[PDB]
Amino acid sequence: DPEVTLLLQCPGGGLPQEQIQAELSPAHDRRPLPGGDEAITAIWETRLKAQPWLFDAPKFRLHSATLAPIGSRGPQLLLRLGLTSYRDFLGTNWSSSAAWLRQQGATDWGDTQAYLADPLGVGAALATADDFLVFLRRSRQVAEAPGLVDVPGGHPEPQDLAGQLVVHELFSSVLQEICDEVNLPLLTLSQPLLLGIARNETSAGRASAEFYVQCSLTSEQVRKHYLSGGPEAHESTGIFFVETQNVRRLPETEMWAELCPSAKGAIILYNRVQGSPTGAALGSPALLPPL
Residues that bind ligand GQJ (CB under 6 A): 55, 57, 86, 89, 119, 155
Q: Cβ of residue 13: shortest distance to ligand GQJ, in angstroms?
A: 29
Residue 47: strand, helix, or coil: helix
If the CB atoms of residues 15 and 198 are measured against ligand GQJ, the closer one turns out to be 198
Nearest 5 degrees, angle CA 124-CA 173-CA 168?
110
Residue 157 in marked binding region: yes
- Which residue is nearest to ligand GQJ, using beta carbons? 57
Name which of 89 and 270 has its Cβ closer to ligand GQJ: 89
Q: Which is nearer to ligand GQJ, 14 or 123 (CB)?
A: 123
Taking the CA atoms of 3, 259, 78 and 28 in sequence, report the sign of the dihedral they define. positive
132 annotated ligand binder: no
Sign of CA dihedral 181, 182, 186, 192: negative
If one counts every other C-beta atom within 10 angstroms of the C-beta of residue 254, the result is: 6
From 274, 242, 275, 245, select the one nearest 256 (Cα to Cα).
242
Is 155 among the annotated ligand-binding positions? yes
Check the annotation: does 272 bind a ligand: no
* 143 annotated ligand-binding residue: yes
Quick count: other Cβ atoms within 10 Å of Cβ 60?
26
Q: How far is the CB of 111 from ligand GQJ (least distance, A)?
A: 20
CB of residue 145 to ligand GQJ, shortest distance in Å: 10
CA distance 65 to 67: 7
> What are the backbone angles phi and psi of residue 151, rounded to the nearest 5°?
-115, 170
Residue 55 is labelled as binding a ligand: yes
Residue 230: beta bridge partners?
none
What is the 3-state secondary structure of 186-210?
A: HHHECCCEEEEEEEEHHHCCEEEEE
CB of 55 to ligand GQJ, least distance (A): 6
Give min distance, CB of 26 to ligand GQJ, in A. Answer: 20
**Which of residues 43 and 78 has its CB atom nearest to ligand GQJ in the complex?**
43
| Closer to ligand GQJ by Cβ: residue 92 or 271 | 92
Binding-site residues sit at 55, 86, 138, 143, 150, 155, 157, 177, 181, 262
As annotated, the binding site for Mg(2+) includes 177, 181
